[PDB]
Short mmCIF file of N, CA and C and ligand atoms in Angstrom, two decimals:
data_model
loop_
_atom_site.label_atom_id
_atom_site.label_comp_id
_atom_site.label_asym_id
_atom_site.label_seq_id
_atom_site.Cartn_x
_atom_site.Cartn_y
_atom_site.Cartn_z
N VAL A 6 145.48 340.36 -2.83
CA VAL A 6 145.35 340.22 -4.00
C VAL A 6 145.22 340.45 -5.25
N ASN A 7 145.64 339.28 -6.30
CA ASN A 7 146.51 339.53 -7.81
C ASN A 7 145.76 340.54 -8.91
N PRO A 8 146.24 341.70 -9.07
CA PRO A 8 145.62 342.40 -9.90
C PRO A 8 145.63 341.40 -11.19
N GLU A 9 144.34 342.58 -12.08
CA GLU A 9 143.48 341.31 -13.67
C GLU A 9 143.88 342.41 -14.71
N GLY A 10 145.09 342.43 -15.25
CA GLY A 10 145.21 343.70 -15.84
C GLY A 10 144.86 343.37 -17.73
N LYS A 11 144.19 344.20 -18.02
CA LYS A 11 143.81 343.88 -19.36
C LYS A 11 144.12 345.25 -20.20
N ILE A 12 144.39 345.83 -21.18
CA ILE A 12 144.86 346.29 -22.27
C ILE A 12 144.12 346.48 -23.59
N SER A 13 143.33 347.46 -23.90
CA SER A 13 142.93 347.81 -25.80
C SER A 13 144.12 348.97 -25.95
N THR A 14 143.63 349.06 -27.07
CA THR A 14 144.90 350.52 -27.51
C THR A 14 144.08 351.34 -28.67
N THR A 15 144.01 352.38 -29.28
CA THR A 15 143.07 353.13 -30.15
C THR A 15 144.52 353.98 -30.94
N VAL A 16 144.78 353.82 -32.23
CA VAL A 16 146.09 354.46 -32.95
C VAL A 16 145.81 355.80 -33.42
N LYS A 17 146.79 357.00 -33.32
CA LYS A 17 146.59 357.95 -34.33
C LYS A 17 147.42 358.72 -35.01
N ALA A 18 147.61 358.28 -36.26
CA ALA A 18 148.06 358.69 -37.63
C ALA A 18 148.01 359.65 -37.78
N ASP A 19 149.03 360.47 -38.16
CA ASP A 19 148.74 361.85 -38.39
C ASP A 19 147.05 362.48 -37.84
N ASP A 20 146.43 362.97 -39.33
CA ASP A 20 145.39 363.39 -38.35
C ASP A 20 143.74 362.50 -38.16
N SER A 21 144.57 361.50 -38.17
CA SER A 21 143.16 360.33 -38.66
C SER A 21 143.47 359.28 -37.04
N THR A 22 142.10 358.73 -36.72
CA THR A 22 142.41 357.88 -35.62
C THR A 22 141.78 356.78 -36.08
N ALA A 23 142.15 355.69 -35.65
CA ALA A 23 141.56 354.45 -35.84
C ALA A 23 140.57 353.74 -35.05
N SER A 24 139.27 352.40 -34.83
CA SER A 24 138.58 352.64 -33.90
C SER A 24 138.43 350.91 -34.43
N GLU A 25 137.02 350.40 -33.62
CA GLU A 25 137.16 348.78 -33.90
C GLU A 25 136.53 348.50 -34.90
N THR A 26 135.92 350.08 -35.67
CA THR A 26 135.41 349.30 -37.51
C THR A 26 135.60 349.79 -37.83
N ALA A 27 136.93 350.43 -38.13
CA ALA A 27 138.01 351.23 -39.29
C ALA A 27 139.19 351.43 -38.90
N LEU A 28 139.95 351.20 -39.55
CA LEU A 28 141.63 351.59 -39.21
C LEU A 28 141.87 352.58 -40.23
N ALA A 29 142.83 353.30 -39.71
CA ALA A 29 143.18 354.51 -39.95
C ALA A 29 143.82 354.81 -40.97
N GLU A 30 143.28 356.20 -42.03
CA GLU A 30 143.73 356.43 -42.92
C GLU A 30 144.38 357.53 -43.44
N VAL A 31 146.20 357.20 -44.18
CA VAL A 31 146.98 358.50 -44.05
C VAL A 31 147.26 358.98 -45.57
N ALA A 32 146.77 360.22 -45.66
CA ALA A 32 147.14 360.43 -47.22
C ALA A 32 148.57 360.28 -47.27
N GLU A 33 149.35 360.10 -48.78
CA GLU A 33 150.65 359.78 -49.33
C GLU A 33 151.32 361.03 -48.74
N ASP A 38 158.15 363.43 -45.11
CA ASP A 38 158.88 364.16 -44.05
C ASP A 38 158.82 363.04 -42.93
N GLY A 39 157.59 362.06 -42.89
CA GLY A 39 157.10 361.25 -41.74
C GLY A 39 156.22 361.55 -40.90
N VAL A 40 155.73 360.49 -40.89
CA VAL A 40 154.06 360.42 -39.95
C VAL A 40 154.07 359.97 -37.97
N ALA A 41 153.04 361.36 -37.86
CA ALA A 41 153.30 361.63 -36.00
C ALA A 41 151.91 360.77 -36.18
N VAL A 42 152.67 359.30 -35.05
CA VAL A 42 151.73 358.26 -34.69
C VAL A 42 151.69 358.22 -32.68
N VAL A 43 150.55 358.12 -32.39
CA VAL A 43 150.28 358.42 -30.84
C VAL A 43 149.33 357.23 -30.94
N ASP A 44 149.47 355.97 -29.78
CA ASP A 44 149.04 355.34 -29.32
C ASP A 44 148.17 355.99 -28.49
N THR A 45 146.77 355.56 -28.14
CA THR A 45 146.33 355.30 -26.55
C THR A 45 145.46 354.15 -26.08
N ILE A 46 146.11 353.80 -24.84
CA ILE A 46 146.40 352.80 -23.98
C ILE A 46 144.96 352.76 -23.26
N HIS A 47 144.31 352.18 -23.17
CA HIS A 47 142.81 352.08 -22.52
C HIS A 47 143.47 350.71 -21.69
N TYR A 48 143.59 351.09 -19.97
CA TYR A 48 144.13 350.02 -19.32
C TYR A 48 143.15 350.03 -17.29
N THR A 49 142.80 348.58 -17.95
CA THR A 49 141.77 348.02 -16.40
C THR A 49 142.65 347.23 -15.41
N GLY A 50 142.74 347.21 -14.10
CA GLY A 50 142.91 346.13 -13.39
C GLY A 50 144.30 346.54 -13.32
N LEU A 51 144.67 347.42 -13.38
CA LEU A 51 146.47 347.79 -12.95
C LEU A 51 146.28 348.35 -11.79
N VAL A 52 146.96 348.60 -10.64
CA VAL A 52 147.29 348.91 -9.17
C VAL A 52 147.41 350.65 -9.43
N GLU A 53 146.41 351.41 -8.50
CA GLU A 53 146.68 352.79 -8.77
C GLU A 53 147.52 353.36 -8.01
N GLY A 54 148.37 354.70 -8.97
CA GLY A 54 149.54 355.05 -7.93
C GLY A 54 150.98 354.32 -8.69
N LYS A 55 150.94 353.24 -9.06
CA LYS A 55 152.06 352.42 -9.29
C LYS A 55 152.43 352.64 -10.57
N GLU A 56 153.43 352.88 -10.73
CA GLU A 56 154.51 353.25 -12.47
C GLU A 56 155.12 351.94 -13.43
N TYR A 57 154.20 352.06 -14.75
CA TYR A 57 154.55 351.00 -15.32
C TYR A 57 155.53 351.25 -16.12
N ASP A 58 156.75 350.59 -17.03
CA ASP A 58 157.59 351.03 -18.10
C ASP A 58 156.43 350.55 -19.63
N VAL A 59 156.06 351.52 -20.53
CA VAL A 59 155.18 350.63 -21.44
C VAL A 59 156.04 350.94 -22.42
N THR A 60 155.94 349.90 -23.45
CA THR A 60 156.81 350.20 -24.81
C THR A 60 155.52 350.10 -25.73
N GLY A 61 155.73 351.03 -26.73
CA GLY A 61 155.37 350.53 -27.94
C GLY A 61 155.85 350.46 -28.72
N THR A 62 155.43 349.41 -30.26
CA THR A 62 156.25 349.10 -31.29
C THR A 62 155.34 348.84 -32.42
N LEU A 63 155.98 349.58 -33.27
CA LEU A 63 155.30 349.69 -35.18
C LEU A 63 156.01 348.94 -35.67
N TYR A 64 155.20 347.86 -36.22
CA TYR A 64 155.62 346.93 -37.23
C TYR A 64 154.41 346.89 -38.18
N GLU A 65 155.05 347.34 -40.19
CA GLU A 65 154.14 346.82 -40.96
C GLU A 65 153.18 345.87 -40.93
N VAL A 66 152.55 345.55 -41.15
CA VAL A 66 151.36 343.92 -41.13
C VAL A 66 150.79 344.18 -42.55
N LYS A 67 150.55 342.90 -43.11
CA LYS A 67 150.03 342.15 -44.56
C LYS A 67 149.43 341.39 -44.47
N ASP A 68 147.86 341.82 -44.16
CA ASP A 68 146.87 340.51 -43.80
C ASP A 68 146.84 340.47 -42.36
N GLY A 69 147.48 341.01 -41.85
CA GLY A 69 147.07 340.88 -40.35
C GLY A 69 148.65 340.01 -39.75
N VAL A 70 149.63 339.54 -40.74
CA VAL A 70 150.74 339.36 -40.15
C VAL A 70 151.89 340.47 -40.28
N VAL A 71 152.65 340.73 -39.14
CA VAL A 71 153.42 341.02 -39.18
C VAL A 71 154.74 340.97 -40.10
N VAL A 72 155.45 341.77 -40.94
CA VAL A 72 156.74 341.94 -41.55
C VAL A 72 157.68 342.55 -41.50
N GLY A 73 158.82 342.39 -41.02
CA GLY A 73 160.31 343.20 -41.12
C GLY A 73 160.17 343.71 -39.44
N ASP A 74 161.88 344.21 -39.45
CA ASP A 74 161.88 345.06 -38.47
C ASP A 74 160.97 345.56 -37.49
N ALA A 75 161.10 345.99 -36.56
CA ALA A 75 160.39 346.98 -35.87
C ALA A 75 160.15 347.99 -36.75
N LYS A 76 160.03 349.25 -36.85
CA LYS A 76 159.46 350.35 -37.57
C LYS A 76 160.46 351.15 -36.55
N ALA A 77 159.31 351.11 -35.33
CA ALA A 77 159.89 352.22 -34.25
C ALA A 77 159.64 351.68 -33.23
N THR A 78 160.27 352.19 -32.07
CA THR A 78 159.77 351.80 -30.65
C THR A 78 159.80 353.46 -29.86
N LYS A 79 159.11 353.35 -28.61
CA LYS A 79 158.75 354.57 -27.69
C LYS A 79 158.74 353.84 -26.58
N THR A 80 159.52 354.00 -25.78
CA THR A 80 159.13 353.62 -24.06
C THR A 80 158.59 355.40 -23.45
N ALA A 81 157.77 354.77 -22.05
CA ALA A 81 157.70 355.80 -21.79
C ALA A 81 157.32 355.36 -19.68
N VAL A 82 157.23 356.15 -18.75
CA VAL A 82 156.74 355.79 -17.35
C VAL A 82 155.15 356.57 -17.01
N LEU A 83 154.36 355.18 -17.15
CA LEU A 83 153.32 356.10 -17.07
C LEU A 83 153.18 355.39 -16.01
N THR A 84 151.86 356.46 -14.74
CA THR A 84 151.39 355.92 -14.02
C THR A 84 149.72 355.39 -13.59
N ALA A 85 149.50 354.48 -13.23
CA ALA A 85 148.24 353.88 -13.26
C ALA A 85 147.15 354.75 -12.68
N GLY A 86 146.04 355.32 -12.89
CA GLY A 86 145.11 356.50 -12.62
C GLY A 86 143.77 355.55 -11.65
N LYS A 87 142.93 356.55 -10.93
CA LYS A 87 141.78 355.78 -10.01
C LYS A 87 141.49 354.43 -10.26
N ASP A 88 140.98 353.59 -9.54
CA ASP A 88 141.18 352.21 -9.35
C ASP A 88 141.62 351.26 -10.13
N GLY A 89 143.04 351.73 -11.12
CA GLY A 89 143.65 350.96 -11.64
C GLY A 89 143.40 351.01 -13.36
N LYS A 90 142.31 351.84 -13.24
CA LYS A 90 141.84 352.06 -14.86
C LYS A 90 142.05 353.69 -15.43
N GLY A 91 141.70 353.62 -17.07
CA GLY A 91 142.03 354.72 -17.09
C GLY A 91 142.58 354.38 -18.81
N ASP A 92 143.29 356.15 -19.46
CA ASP A 92 143.84 356.06 -20.72
C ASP A 92 145.06 356.26 -20.46
N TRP A 93 146.49 356.14 -21.24
CA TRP A 93 147.70 356.57 -21.16
C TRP A 93 147.58 357.19 -22.60
N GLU A 94 148.27 357.76 -23.32
CA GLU A 94 148.89 358.03 -24.63
C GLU A 94 150.45 358.27 -24.33
N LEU A 95 150.98 357.05 -25.86
CA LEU A 95 152.02 357.01 -25.92
C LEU A 95 152.27 357.59 -27.35
N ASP A 96 153.01 359.13 -27.47
CA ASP A 96 153.32 359.53 -28.07
C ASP A 96 154.55 358.76 -28.83
N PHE A 97 154.54 358.50 -30.16
CA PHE A 97 155.88 357.64 -31.32
C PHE A 97 156.48 359.22 -31.16
N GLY A 98 155.94 360.20 -31.39
CA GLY A 98 156.32 361.31 -32.59
C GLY A 98 156.36 361.24 -34.03
N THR A 99 156.92 361.67 -34.62
CA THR A 99 157.19 361.54 -36.39
C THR A 99 157.84 360.43 -36.48
N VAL A 100 157.46 358.98 -37.65
CA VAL A 100 158.28 358.03 -37.76
C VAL A 100 158.06 357.75 -38.96
N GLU A 101 159.85 357.80 -39.57
CA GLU A 101 160.31 358.11 -40.63
C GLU A 101 160.46 356.80 -41.40
N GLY A 102 160.48 356.78 -42.73
CA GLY A 102 160.67 355.45 -43.70
C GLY A 102 159.43 354.79 -43.79
N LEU A 103 158.65 355.31 -43.75
CA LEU A 103 156.98 354.36 -44.20
C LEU A 103 156.93 354.24 -45.37
N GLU A 104 155.84 353.46 -45.91
CA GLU A 104 156.31 353.26 -47.64
C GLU A 104 154.59 353.72 -47.96
N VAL A 105 154.11 354.37 -49.18
CA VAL A 105 152.34 354.45 -49.58
C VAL A 105 152.61 352.87 -49.74
N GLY A 106 151.09 352.96 -49.36
CA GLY A 106 150.16 351.55 -50.09
C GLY A 106 150.42 350.79 -48.38
N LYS A 107 151.37 351.06 -47.95
CA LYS A 107 151.88 349.59 -46.47
C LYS A 107 150.92 350.17 -45.57
N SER A 108 150.45 349.04 -44.50
CA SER A 108 149.68 349.00 -43.51
C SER A 108 150.61 348.87 -42.23
N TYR A 109 150.62 349.16 -41.09
CA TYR A 109 151.44 349.49 -40.10
C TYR A 109 150.42 349.47 -38.49
N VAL A 110 150.88 348.64 -37.55
CA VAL A 110 149.83 348.21 -36.23
C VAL A 110 150.87 348.32 -35.19
N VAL A 111 150.30 348.91 -34.12
CA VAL A 111 150.98 349.07 -33.21
C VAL A 111 150.78 348.23 -32.61
N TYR A 112 151.82 347.70 -31.44
CA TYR A 112 152.00 346.26 -30.41
C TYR A 112 152.30 347.54 -29.02
N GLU A 113 151.65 347.02 -27.38
CA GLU A 113 152.10 347.97 -26.63
C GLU A 113 152.38 346.57 -25.72
N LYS A 114 153.49 346.94 -24.53
CA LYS A 114 153.95 345.95 -23.17
C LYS A 114 153.66 347.11 -22.43
N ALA A 115 152.88 346.73 -21.00
CA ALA A 115 153.36 347.19 -19.84
C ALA A 115 154.12 346.88 -18.92
N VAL A 116 154.94 346.87 -18.04
CA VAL A 116 155.59 345.97 -16.72
C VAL A 116 155.99 346.71 -15.53
N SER A 117 154.97 346.74 -14.59
CA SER A 117 155.27 347.28 -13.27
C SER A 117 156.92 347.88 -13.21
N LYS A 118 157.20 348.68 -12.64
CA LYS A 118 158.67 348.77 -12.06
C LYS A 118 158.31 348.06 -10.47
N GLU A 119 157.32 347.86 -9.68
CA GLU A 119 157.27 347.16 -8.14
C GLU A 119 156.65 346.24 -8.33
N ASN A 120 156.83 344.68 -7.48
CA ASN A 120 156.65 343.80 -7.36
C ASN A 120 155.50 343.71 -7.26
N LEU A 121 154.09 343.51 -7.85
CA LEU A 121 152.88 343.56 -7.29
C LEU A 121 151.84 342.08 -7.63
N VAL A 122 152.55 341.37 -8.06
CA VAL A 122 152.08 339.79 -8.47
C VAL A 122 152.59 339.18 -7.51
N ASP A 123 151.77 338.23 -6.57
CA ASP A 123 152.32 337.28 -5.41
C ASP A 123 151.85 336.01 -6.28
N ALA A 124 153.19 335.31 -7.37
CA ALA A 124 153.07 334.39 -8.12
C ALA A 124 152.88 333.17 -7.72
N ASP A 125 153.66 332.49 -6.31
CA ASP A 125 153.91 331.79 -5.76
C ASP A 125 152.80 331.49 -4.19
N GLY A 126 151.95 332.30 -3.87
CA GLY A 126 150.70 332.20 -3.14
C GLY A 126 151.22 332.71 -1.71
N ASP A 127 152.71 332.87 -1.62
CA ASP A 127 152.53 332.74 0.11
C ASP A 127 152.46 334.48 0.62
N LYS A 128 150.97 335.35 -0.15
CA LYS A 128 150.55 336.01 0.28
C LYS A 128 152.08 337.35 0.18
N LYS A 129 152.54 337.65 -0.54
CA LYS A 129 153.63 338.05 -0.39
C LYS A 129 154.16 338.75 -1.80
N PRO A 130 153.87 340.07 -2.16
CA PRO A 130 153.82 340.27 -3.85
C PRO A 130 156.05 339.98 -4.23
N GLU A 131 156.08 339.24 -5.48
CA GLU A 131 157.82 338.88 -5.74
C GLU A 131 157.62 338.93 -7.29
N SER A 132 156.52 339.75 -8.42
CA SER A 132 156.53 339.88 -9.77
C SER A 132 156.02 340.72 -10.05
N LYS A 133 156.55 341.04 -11.17
CA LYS A 133 156.16 341.89 -12.33
C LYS A 133 154.49 342.07 -12.46
N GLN A 134 153.63 343.06 -12.38
CA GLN A 134 152.34 343.16 -13.34
C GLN A 134 152.65 342.96 -14.73
N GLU A 135 152.35 342.07 -15.99
CA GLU A 135 152.87 342.44 -16.95
C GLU A 135 151.94 342.60 -18.25
N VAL A 136 151.44 343.71 -18.96
CA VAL A 136 150.34 343.50 -20.06
C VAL A 136 150.50 343.33 -21.18
N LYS A 137 149.79 342.74 -21.98
CA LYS A 137 150.38 343.26 -23.23
C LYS A 137 149.15 343.28 -24.28
N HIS A 138 149.54 343.78 -25.22
CA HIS A 138 148.18 344.28 -26.89
C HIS A 138 149.24 343.90 -27.60
N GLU A 139 149.20 342.04 -28.10
CA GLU A 139 149.97 342.65 -30.07
C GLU A 139 149.10 341.72 -30.77
N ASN A 140 148.33 341.94 -31.16
CA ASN A 140 147.03 341.68 -32.00
C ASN A 140 147.42 342.57 -33.80
N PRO A 141 147.66 341.85 -34.48
CA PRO A 141 148.50 342.28 -35.52
C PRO A 141 147.15 342.25 -36.70
N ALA A 142 145.84 341.85 -36.11
CA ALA A 142 144.11 341.64 -36.63
C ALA A 142 143.45 342.85 -36.22
N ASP A 143 144.12 343.94 -35.05
CA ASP A 143 143.10 345.20 -34.24
C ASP A 143 143.40 345.85 -35.06
N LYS A 144 142.55 345.95 -36.02
CA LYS A 144 142.14 347.30 -36.85
C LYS A 144 141.94 348.73 -35.74
N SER A 145 141.65 348.86 -34.84
CA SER A 145 141.93 349.99 -34.02
C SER A 145 143.52 350.27 -33.57
N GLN A 146 144.81 349.46 -34.14
CA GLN A 146 145.49 349.83 -33.87
C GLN A 146 146.60 349.83 -35.27
N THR A 147 145.47 349.82 -36.00
CA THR A 147 146.45 349.51 -37.63
C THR A 147 145.61 351.39 -38.52
N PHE A 148 146.91 351.43 -39.26
CA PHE A 148 147.22 352.58 -40.01
C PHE A 148 147.65 351.88 -41.21
N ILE A 149 146.59 352.65 -42.51
CA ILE A 149 147.46 352.89 -43.90
C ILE A 149 147.85 354.37 -44.36
N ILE A 150 148.62 354.10 -45.31
CA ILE A 150 149.20 355.30 -46.03
C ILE A 150 148.78 354.77 -47.13
N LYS A 151 147.69 355.65 -47.53
CA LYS A 151 147.29 355.98 -49.10
C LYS A 151 147.74 356.97 -50.08
CA1 CA B 201 155.10 335.73 -3.18
NA1 NA B 202 141.23 349.27 -29.53
#
């Protein structure tokens, strides 16, 4: 049966964690950015190519080129549910007064999805979280 993947995220910028109810605030060398990926409906023990992208955002609209990208190879935990940490490290060249949002993609290394329904997987499982208006993935530099 085909896996039904879902991901949400929570960003931490410097010492400051965002949440469903408030974006993270960073006090005016670079900003340490860590994104937590909350996943369900992945395949236990399978490896995923995870790509995080940091964008400047203005009123829930992405502006300009990515400020940073980070990739990792992470393994799905028990029942294909759990949390991953994607550490971007220090991100240089962010601007005081500006807001940033994290986008995430995870693509399985193995074929985990039977897209043509012959009961044999032939497609990668791909999950995305690309919401420019998600305050839990957003931080502002004060
Ligand atoms: Ca197939
Ligand atoms: Na979230």
